Design a protein around this ligand. Structure first.
Ligand SMILES: [Ca+2]
Ligand SMILES: [Ca+2]
Ligand SMILES: [Ca+2]
Ligand SMILES: [Ca+2]
Lengths: 194, 97, 176, 149
């Protein structure tokens, strides 16, 4: 079906960051359709990551960055490649690295996104397509990160969960249909109480 | 006489000379004398009045110094423009404008 | 540039360090002449200001004949240097750092470098994006300070320099 | 004003042109007088359009064209030739040599002629602001979009 195709994993809204520089890694066990990046707390579970303004993700299947659309960025990944997602809320930039090498667009731009407004904040997020396996490392154990020292440690970035006891609680988009109240601001459906 | 002056190249080549001769003052004084007589009941010789007014309008457009010179008589033109509505064409109010 | 991807670590000490050191002392020698001119202001200082401009122009040519090779070499070996600290890599950081300081302080150095790039049609963008094209991936196209190889090489060697300093030295760095 | 738009020579030339139309010398241009010169130039218009091309410039509506109206026509023709090309002459003031770029030395030359003086260093400040390409010269395209140098 249309919905049992992409499964979105994100951190809990209580971990939203509105300042500082943060780093985490995503390992692509498979090479298919997987996206990883940063998302706002109001992220919608039934929308592909980056198809709207609520997520800034990098699609490593074919080397694309997604935010309100797709544009080429970087190179496609391989099995075992580690993607280092870096967000800088002091410069309002997002940087993606592949195996310690910073990905670049079709220009000298070393940053995937620029002039991003903080607003509510950002959360680490990833989406996996059908038959896709990925490893998310939020950096609770700094020694477990494989490319943080190579690119990210000297730039002032910190692991997303550097000082945390319990592992970061994650929420996933469950493809089980449920009945919910019709939103008062639904674009297509209106309910009038007569 | 006005037509011959406006047909002369010197009138346009040397606006300062025309200003020195007091040509605009002389034409204005002739116009107001006609406007002064019969200032309320009837204006006679309308063709002369519209010829003098048209002359002064072209006089202003030659140079800004000519336009400034006619600006010094703005109040003088306005007080004679109350009955200028009767004449049609070029009027003292048009000269002030 | 294509053949540097297979360079061995021995080239850092055998070739790159002696070559950059010669460029570093040449840069220091020219700026020493430049400051000599300004301390004694004279109508003759113009006759000699052109001399240092020529010296800066030839110097910028030498830097742009080695930095594109150095930049690619640094990219393929920066991970190893950060993983295991290297005395030679730290020494190279001082050399490129001092050249950058000379470039930042000297006004003619910036002018001659900009003239060299525009007059020789140096891309200054393929030198930084060749690795991305190698991996099968407007504003300042003619010249930009951001894409200058003198400052681009330093920014790629900056993590090596920061790796020397301990985290306890962050307060000292701010004071300095 | 006519003095701004026209010089003494141009007024003399226009008067000769007006006298060429006015063969009578009475000081007014009639339809037949206007029609006669058109036939000498080859055109053979009708009186319907001949009156229209008179009323288009006849101010007082008397049906004839005198020298003040003739000069007013020519004054507009000289004035409306230039509409927004004033930036072209402004560009050439800074562009002494005649090419399509403004050099720092050329910017020094105009600044030298003007009252304000530069210390040979801030001249680079505004030229790099105007020059987006970074080649050290401000072209015509860069000048019109934003003017600082
Ligand atoms: Ca006639
Ligand atoms: Ca007429
Ligand atoms: Ca020029
Ligand atoms: Ca330019």
């Amino acid at each position: 079906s249309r919905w049992d195709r992409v499964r979105i994993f994100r951190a809990e809204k209580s971990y939203t960051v509105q300042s500082g520089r943060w780093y985490f890694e995503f390992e692509a066990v498979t090479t298919g359709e997987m996206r990883v990046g940063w998302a706002r707390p109001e992220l919608r579970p039934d929308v592909e990551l980056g198809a709207d303004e609520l997520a800034y993700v990098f699609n490593g299947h074919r080397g694309q960055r997604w935010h309100l659309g797709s544009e080429p960025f970087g190179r496609p990944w391989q099995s075992g490649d580690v993607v280092g997602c870096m967000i800088d809320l002091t410069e309002n930039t997002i940087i993606f690295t592949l195996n310690g090498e910073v990905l670049m667009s079709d220009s000298g731009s070393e940053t995937a996104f620029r002039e991003i407004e903080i607003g509510d904040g950002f959360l680490p997020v990833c989406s996996l397509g059908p038959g896709q396996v990925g490893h998310l490392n939020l950096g609770q154990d700094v020694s477990s990160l494989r490319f943080f020292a190579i690119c990210g440690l000297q730039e002032g970035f910190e692991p997303f969960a550097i000082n945390m006891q319990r592992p970061v609680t994650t929420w996933f988009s469950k493809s089980l249909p449920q009945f919910e109240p019709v939103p008062p601001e639904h674009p297509h459906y209106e309910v009038a109480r007569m | 006489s006005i037509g011959n002056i406006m047909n002369n190249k010197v009138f346009y080549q040397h606006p300062n000379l025309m200003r020195a001769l007091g040509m605009h003052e002389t034409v204005m004084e002739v116009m107001v004398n006609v406007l002064g007589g019969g200032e309320t009941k009837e204006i006679r010789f309308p063709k002369m009045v519209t010829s003098c007014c048209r002359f002064l309008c072209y006089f202003c457009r030659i140079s800004r110094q000519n336009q400034r010179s006619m600006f010094d008589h703005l109040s003088y033109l306005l007080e004679n423009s109350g009955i200028g509505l009767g004449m049609q064409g070029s009027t003292p109010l048009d000269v002030a404008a | 540039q294509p053949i540097v991807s297979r360079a061995r670590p021995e080239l850092l000490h055998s070739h790159f360090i002696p070559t950059i050191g010669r460029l570093r002392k040449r840069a220091g020698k020219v700026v020493a002449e430049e400051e000599q001119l300004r301390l004694e202001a004279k109508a003759e200082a113009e006759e000699g200001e052109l001399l240092v401009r020529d010296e800066f122009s030839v110097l910028c040519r030498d830097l742009y004949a080695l930095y594109p090779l150095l930049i690619r070499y640094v990219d393929n070996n920066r991970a190893h240097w950060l993983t295991e600290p290297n005395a030679n890599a730290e020494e190279l950081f001082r050399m490129v750092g001092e050249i950058f300081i000379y470039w930042s302080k000297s006004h003619n150095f910036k002018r001659e470098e900009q003239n060299f790039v525009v007059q020789n049609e140096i891309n200054n963008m393929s030198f930084l994006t060749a690795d991305s094209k190698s991996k099968m991936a407007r504003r300042g196209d003619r010249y930009s300070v951001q894409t200058s190889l003198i400052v681009a090489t330093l920014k790629k060697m900056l993590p090596i320099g920061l790796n020397m300093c301990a985290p306890t030295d962050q307060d000292l760095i701010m004071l300095a | 004003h006519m003095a701004d738009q026209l010089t003494e020579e141009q007024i003399a030339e226009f008067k000769e042109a007006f006298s060429l139309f006015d063969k009578d010398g009475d000081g007014t241009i009639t339809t037949k007088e206007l029609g006669t010169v058109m036939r000498s130039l080859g055109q053979n218009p009708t009186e319907a359009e001949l009156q229209d091309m008179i009323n288009e410039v006849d101010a007082d509506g008397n049906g004839t064209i005198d020298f003040p109206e003739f000069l007013t026509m020519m004054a507009r023709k000289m004035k409306d030739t230039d509409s927004e090309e004033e930036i072209r002459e402004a560009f050439r003031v800074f562009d002494k040599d005649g090419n399509g770029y403004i050099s720092a030395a050329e910017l020094r030359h105009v600044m030298t002629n003007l009252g304000e003086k530069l210390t040979d260093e801030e001249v680079d400040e505004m030229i790099r602001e105007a020059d987006i390409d970074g080649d050290g010269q401000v072209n015509y395209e860069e000048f019109v979009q934003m003017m600082t140098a």
